[PDB]
Design a binder for this molecule. Structure first.
Ligand SMILES: CC[N+](C)(C)CCCS(=O)(=O)[O-]
Ligand SMILES: CC[N+](C)(C)CCCS(=O)(=O)[O-]
Lengths: 278, 290
């Protein structure tokens, strides 16, 4: 029951005290991170630290996420390294994802269940998760191409679980932190599972205050934005894929459509070229 | 009010040999990113160590005094004599920097954060431009190595050692305490002078041992070996009787260079952590009948 195992991983991630020492591998290279999580006063407490170079820090205290290099904002979880699929509602996903068992294997000196998370309609990237058989915490996570090429890799190098909370986190618990629309277009085609999260109109940083209209879509796991703005003679069709960011611009009619998010290029384009106007 | 680079390096060496610690590190090279764990302690005025491969089959290597035991996937384990576990730590760590200094330069490149620690950054370069070099990041408190790169003469990195998490001075683990008293696999099993010597060696190198060994051939063809080291890098000069099938060739993989040259009736093959150019220069400077 992979579905159940994945739900358990999510739950372990949200409710245990733990420290993960892990590396993030992608085209940029091998980055060294530390994540600490705890529960204190029935409230989440977390720290993501960049280990090498300048001291980039991010902390979570309840729904306050404070960033450091010096602000804070609201959110239910730290984003985009610590594998956002760890905070995924897998019950929400099951109708349109397959969870596939690929057996057990040693990662980080632990026996792990290995599970593929694939969207049924062949439309998105996929994950494969190695989870600790005891703690249920994620030991390794690969983000994969539709062609099986790896875009991003999360690998735990050392960890501990169930220990009492660091002086750091014990401090952070009390320490004071920094604290801080209707469109004329819709997408006619979205991959099975996606639904709108928010809409916004934003003035572009240009001499004309030219609006850009954005819809944020998510399927509980992957997310992207559809951005529309009035076309100019300098607007062009183009595709850029780096890692998990695809930027797909297409010009249709008098509009500049740009899709930004975790999507195979093909899918982004298919969305772009299915927006109905008027 | 900060020490010369050589004093720092000596400190790191000392820290490595006398502290109890655990390094969780990755070694990066053309193979990929491999995840290792190294534990070191001293118990009964004796070294105690464990190198564990963290992913896949459970490859383990352990040190107890001067015995090194090798544990493997579905294999009978064995023990050898050795002063330290190899392919663990970069060899750089066991180095005697007092010894190296007449022929190496130790160059400060400042301080930087590795593994949430302020580190001194130091290049270790051989003065005669003859070898690969290292750059070390060393924890400013513990003195332990936090990162180590081995570099081409062109600055390309051949191998990288990076600690991801570590602890120091913490109690010797009950796993390690078990090892001290554990049953180790039984220890598993020539002294001569030759007619040839290398006339050119990089500044610093000196002979470690000599041996004559019968090759695994129908004729019991001897092969004569001199092991050289400079305290950091090491190589062997191997001579054997040339055959019609003996050819000049160079193979460099990572930090193994195999350089064969045939001069006169001899097949000379140099094996070790040396730039190809240097290996060849040694091979083609052996005299015979000295
Ligand atoms: C086939 C070549 N590219 C564009 C990289 C496609 C890779 C597969 S996909 O759809 O997941 O991006
Ligand atoms: C000079 C070109 N090659 C041999 C490829 C670069 C290696 C330089 S080396 O071996 O001395 O570091």
């Amino acid at each position: 029951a992979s579905g159940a195992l994945l739900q358990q991983m999510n739950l372990a991630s949200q409710s245990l005290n733990y420290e993960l020492s892990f590396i993030s591998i992608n085209k940029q290279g091998v980055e060294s991170l530390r994540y600490r999580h705890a529960r204190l006063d029935n409230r989440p407490l977390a720290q993501l630290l960049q280990m090498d170079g300048p001291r980039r820090e991010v902390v979570q205290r309840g729904n306050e996420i404070s960033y450091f290099e010096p602000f804070t904002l609201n959110g239910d979880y730290i984003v985009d390294s610590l594998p956002s699929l760890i905070y995924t509602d897998f019950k929400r996903l099951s109708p349109y994802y397959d969870f596939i068992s690929v057996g057990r294997t040693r990662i980080a000196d632990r026996l792990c269940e290995v599970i593929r998370v694939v969207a049924r309609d062949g439309t998105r990237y996929s994950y494969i998760v190695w989870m600790d058989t005891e703690s249920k915490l994620p030991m390794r996570v690969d983000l994969l191409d539709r062609d099986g090429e790896t875009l991003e890799q999360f690998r735990v190098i050392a960890f501990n679980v169930n220990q009492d909370i660091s002086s750091s986190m014990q401090t952070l618990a009390k320490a004071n932190l920094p604290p801080l629309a209707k469109f004329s277009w819709t997408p006619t085609w979205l991959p099975q599972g996606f639904s709108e999260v928010s809409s916004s109109r934003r003035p572009l940083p240009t001499m004309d205050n030219m609006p850009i209209e954005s819809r944020l879509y998510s399927d509980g796991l992957f997310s992207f934005s559809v951005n529309v703005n009035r076309a100019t003679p300098s607007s062009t069709d183009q595709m850029l894929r780096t890692g998990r960011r695809t930027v797909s611009t297409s010009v249709r009619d008098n509009a500049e459509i740009t899709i930004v998010g975790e999507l195979p290029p093909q899918t982004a384009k298919r969305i772009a070229e299915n927006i109905k106007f008027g």
